[PDB]
Amino acid sequence: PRHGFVEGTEGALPKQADVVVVGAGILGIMTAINLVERGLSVVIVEKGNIAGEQSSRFYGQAISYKMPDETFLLHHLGKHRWREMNAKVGIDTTYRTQGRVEVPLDEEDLVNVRKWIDERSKNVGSDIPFKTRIIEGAELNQRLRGATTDWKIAGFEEDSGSFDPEVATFVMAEYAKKMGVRIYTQCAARGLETQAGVISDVVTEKGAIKTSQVVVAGGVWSRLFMQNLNVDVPTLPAYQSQQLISGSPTAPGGNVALPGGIFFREQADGTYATSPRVIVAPVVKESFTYGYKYLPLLALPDFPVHISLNEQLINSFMQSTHWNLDEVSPFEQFRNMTALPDLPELNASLEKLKAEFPAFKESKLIDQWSGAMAIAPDENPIISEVKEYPGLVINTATGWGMTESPVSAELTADLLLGKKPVLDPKPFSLYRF
Numbered sequence: 144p145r146h147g148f149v150e151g152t153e154g155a156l157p158k159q160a161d162v163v164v165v166g167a168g169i170l171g172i173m174t175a176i177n178l179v180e181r182g183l184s185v186v187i188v189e190k191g192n193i194a195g196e197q198s199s200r201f202y203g204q205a206i207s208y209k210m211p212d213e214t215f216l217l218h219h220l221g222k223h224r225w226r227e228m229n230a231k232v233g234i235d236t237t238y239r240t241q242g243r244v245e246v247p248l249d250e251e252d253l254v255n256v257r258k259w260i261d262e263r264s265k266n267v268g269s270d271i272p273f274k275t276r277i278i279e280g281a282e283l284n285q286r287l288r289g290a291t292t293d294w295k296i297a298g299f300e301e302d303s304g305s306f307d308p309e310v311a312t313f314v315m316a317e318y319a320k321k322m323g324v325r326i327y328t329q330c331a332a333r334g335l336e337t338q339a340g341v342i343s344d345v346v347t348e349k350g351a352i353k354t355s356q357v358v359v360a361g362g363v364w365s366r367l368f369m370q371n372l373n374v375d376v377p378t379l380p381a382y383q384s385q386q387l388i389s390g391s392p393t394a395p396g397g398n399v400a401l402p403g404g405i406f407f408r409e410q411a412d413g414t415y416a417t418s419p420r421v422i423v424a425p426v427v428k429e430s431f432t433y434g435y436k437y438l439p440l441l442a443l444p445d446f447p448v449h450i451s452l453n454e455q456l457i458n459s460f461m462q463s464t465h466w467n468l469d470e471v472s473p474f475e476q477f478r479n480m481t482a483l484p485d486l487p488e489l490n491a492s493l494e495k496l497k498a499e500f501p502a503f504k505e506s507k508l509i510d511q512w513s514g515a516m517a518i519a520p521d522e523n524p525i526i527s528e529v530k531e532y533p534g535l536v537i538n539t540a541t542g543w544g545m546t547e548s549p550v551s552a553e554l555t556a557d558l559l560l561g562k563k564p565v566l567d568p569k570p571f572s573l574y575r576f
């Protein structure tokens with residue numbers, strides 16, 4: 144049709160659940176799956192529709208490229224587990240092993256790229272083979288078919304993944320449901336009841352579910368959920384426009400990242416996803432409190448963050464920091480995000496793409512949207528225990544949640560159940576700030 148939809152679990156809201164997941168995005172869905180495999184019966188509550196936010200509004204690349212030591216193995220294994228996903232689910236998630244070329248900006252960028260590849264080749268940290276190398280000549284020109292500029296050198300992540308926003312998370316939701324995961328849609332989680340340390344209930348607009356174990360995977364809303372429970376989660380909003388164009392017989396295929404803001408990725412159906420580099424950070428109330436911690440990100444001149452003043456500031460001041468569980472929460476008050484794509488920005492970006500790859504000159508515009516992130520000061524995920532509430536774990540605050548989800552899921556479940564974590568959880572801890 145155009146977008147793809149998964150229907151929620153029908154009937155009455157259950158009295159009891161072994162574990163309740165807040166949010167039916169990728170992180171919530173994958174964590175649910177991981178828990179079921181361990182033998183737990185899970186219930187996901189979702190304020191809107193399944194994968195209505197970030198998890199159907201992403202660019203679509205699963206890459207380990209330029210990733211720091213903190214997140215590399217989370218991405219490296221994410222790629223590996225996504226390669227087994229189609230076989231595991233038995234339905235096409237649209238995950239493809241695609242390949243990605245990034246032409247560096249400066250000679251200095253080329254040295255930084257070379258060093259990063261060389262450092263990671265000598266010490267991989269996994270028995271999964273590392274498949275990223277610098278490419279020149281014929282190998283590069285085959286990857287850039289019908290390019291105007293004579294590009295000489297690029298970093299080639301051969302095993303870079305591709306997933307499509309209109310399909311990926313939705314298939315994973317249906318697979319979750321087939322495992323016995325119950326997902327209740329249009330059903331916002333306001334907060335939780337706690338008695339003598341142990342969680343007793345999760346309170347929703349449809350009623351209360353008795354549980355002692357909670358997974359918070361509310362995407363951009365995770366901070367606001369933990370605010371009402373008096374736990375500080377440091378995230379700031381970020382926005383990026385995305386667009387989707389039709390295919391071409393003379394189109395180059397694969398994933399391409401070029402100087403001059405040229406970024407495109409071929410989908411499973413032959414259509415092309417493209418976007419500008421520019422990330423828009425709107426001014427919120429939180430900007431005045433801990434926005435100073437985000438200043439070293441504005442340091443890089445290759446960094447594309449614009450500070451913007453819009454309606455988010457006004458919305459921020461009129462979102463409550465505290466609410467009673469028997470009254471209307473901001474998750475109901477601001478249920479559906481209404482953020483629009485920057486249409487002049489997307490147009491200029493597309494015109495640059497058409498100038499570099501004239502194969503796209505005849506391509507028709509399929510879809511244009513805005514995508515909202517929430518990012519921590521060091522740009523790394525929050526996958527953590529919550530000291531203040533035993534049995535509560537949080538899986539959120541990531542710009543790479545699709546790639547990271549199969550490993551994030553296991554790591555979240557490990558923290559919840561007291562098992563030794565898959566990877567070092569210290570860089571993903573809530574208390575690192």
Ligand SMILES: Cc1cc2nc3c(=O)[nH]c(=O)nc-3n(C[C@H](O)[C@H](O)[C@H](O)COP(=O)(O)OP(=O)(O)OC[C@H]3O[C@@H](n4cnc5c(N)ncnc54)[C@H](O)[C@@H]3O)c2cc1C
Pocket residue numbers: 165166167168169170171188189190191192193194195196197198199200201202203204205330331332333360361362363364365368382383384385474513514515516538539540541542543544545546547
């Ligand atoms: C423009 C853009 C491009 C991106 N490109 C890429 C990419 O190329 N590669 C990549 O790996 N990643 C990419 N990402 C990131 C990826 O989309 C996210 O990191 C991932 O979807 C995070 O999943 P999530 O479940 O935490 O958040 P979401 O998918 O937003 O899920 C959170 C859900 O929780 C629900 N919720 C919140 N509060 C409550 C409540 N109180 N009660 C009930 N439900 C609640 C929300 O309605 C929402 O559906 C991109 C993101 C954006 C915005």
Ligand SMILES: CCCCCCCCCCCCCCCC[N+](C)(C)C
Pocket residue numbers: 452453454455456457
């Ligand atoms: C320069 C320092 C001024 C201190 C005031 C800080 C508090 C903010 C007061 C509200 C200002 C209104 C901003 C409205 C922006 C929304 N729109 C862009 C959509 C109009």
Ligand SMILES: CCCCCCCCCCCCCCCC[N+](C)(C)C
Pocket residue numbers: 457460461462463464
């Ligand atoms: C001359 C410039 C005046 C600009 C002032 C406009 C500010 C209006 C913004 C709305 C303020 C939010 C309302 C507070 C209620 C929310 N809380 C209950 C959470 C405090």
Ligand SMILES: CCCCCCCCCCCCCCCC[N+](C)(C)C
Pocket residue numbers: 379380381383422424430434435437438440448516518522542543
């Ligand atoms: C002075 C106030 C500073 C506030 C700036 C806040 C910065 C917002 C953080 C955005 C940077 C994260 C970039 C990740 C984007 C990656 N993806 C495009 C893949 C999602």
